[PDB]
Design a protein around this ligand. Structure first.
Ligand SMILES: O=c1c(O)c(-c2cc(O)c(O)c(O)c2)oc2cc(O)cc(O)c12
Length: 237
């Protein structure tokens, strides 16, 4: 993710087929002449999309120009959570399914995976980052405390940010409850709150594996609900 002139980010297209599919997804959702109510509502929950972008002298080098969802924050605390029971898509080979399940074999049970987090700590004026291996080490036994860490400034548990996150996720859940045209695999939610009350961004990102469907995205729904339940339990801390 690169920064660009302010308020936006450039996301480089992943290698094919992933990049082209993510391009296609944003193009579909933000089609000028789209009057599909499902897709118009979905725009609210994504970064605003400004189209394909390439450097002036490098048409080969393909990015998505996207809203910087952290732009309005002073000291943003950010968590990326992959959502769903399966992070492989409907046309994955046996090798690919195994490859994806082995990255985090608890995906079916938990329905989400923390990809990373960056948390501003007040006491030290510094950031604490967790990588891929943090969330992949979390179990049913440790997921609640694993998620809680995101809302720790090192003075208090930010239950205001936790409650706001639940309320924002609930809207996304409602959108999923009201559509049967897209299924999302290996897609994520980006949570942002202010680390420097109740002010949160939750946006959907990572759309290299979104496919046409004629069913409710049940794995996504499962994950969102479990994530809501975990966040809700954290409000009892
Ligand atoms: O707007 C975005 C953003 O700010 C970040 C981001 C992610 C991190 O993991 C950070 O540590 C950070 O500072 C920013 O990612 C994104 C990823 C997307 O696919 C789309 C986006 O629009 C953003």
């Amino acid at each position: 993710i690169l920064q660009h002139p302010d308020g936006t980010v450039l996301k480089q297209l992943q290698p094919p087929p992933r990049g082209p599919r993510e391009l296609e997804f944003y193009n579909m959702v933000y089609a000028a002449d789209c009057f599909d109510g499902v897709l118009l509502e979905l725009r609210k929950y994504l970064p605003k999309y400004y189209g394909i972008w390439s450097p002036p002298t490098a048409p080969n080098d393909l990015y998505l120009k996207l809203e910087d969802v952290t732009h309005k924050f002073n000291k943003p605390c950010i968590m990326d959570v992959k959502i769903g029971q399966k992070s492989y898509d409907p046309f994955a080979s046996s090798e690919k399914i195994q490859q994806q399940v082995s990255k985090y074999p608890l995906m079916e049970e938990i329905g989400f995976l923390v990809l990373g987090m960056r948390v501003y700590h007040v006491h030290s004026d510094s950031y604490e980052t967790e990588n891929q291996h943090y969330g992949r080490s979390l179990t049913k036994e440790t997921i609640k405390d694993g998620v809680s860490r995101f809302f720790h400034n090192g003075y208090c548990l930010r239950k205001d940010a936790v409650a706001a996150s639940i309320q924002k996720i609930e809207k996304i859940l409602q959108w999923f409850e009201n559509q049967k045209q897209l299924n999302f695999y290996a897609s994520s939610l980006l949570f942002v709150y202010e680390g420097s009350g109740g002010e949160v961004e939750v946006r959907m990102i990572d759309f290299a594996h979104v496919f046409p469907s004629n069913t409710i995205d049940e794995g996504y729904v499962y994950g969102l609900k479990h994530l809501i339940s975990v966040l809700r339990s954290i409000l009892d801390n």
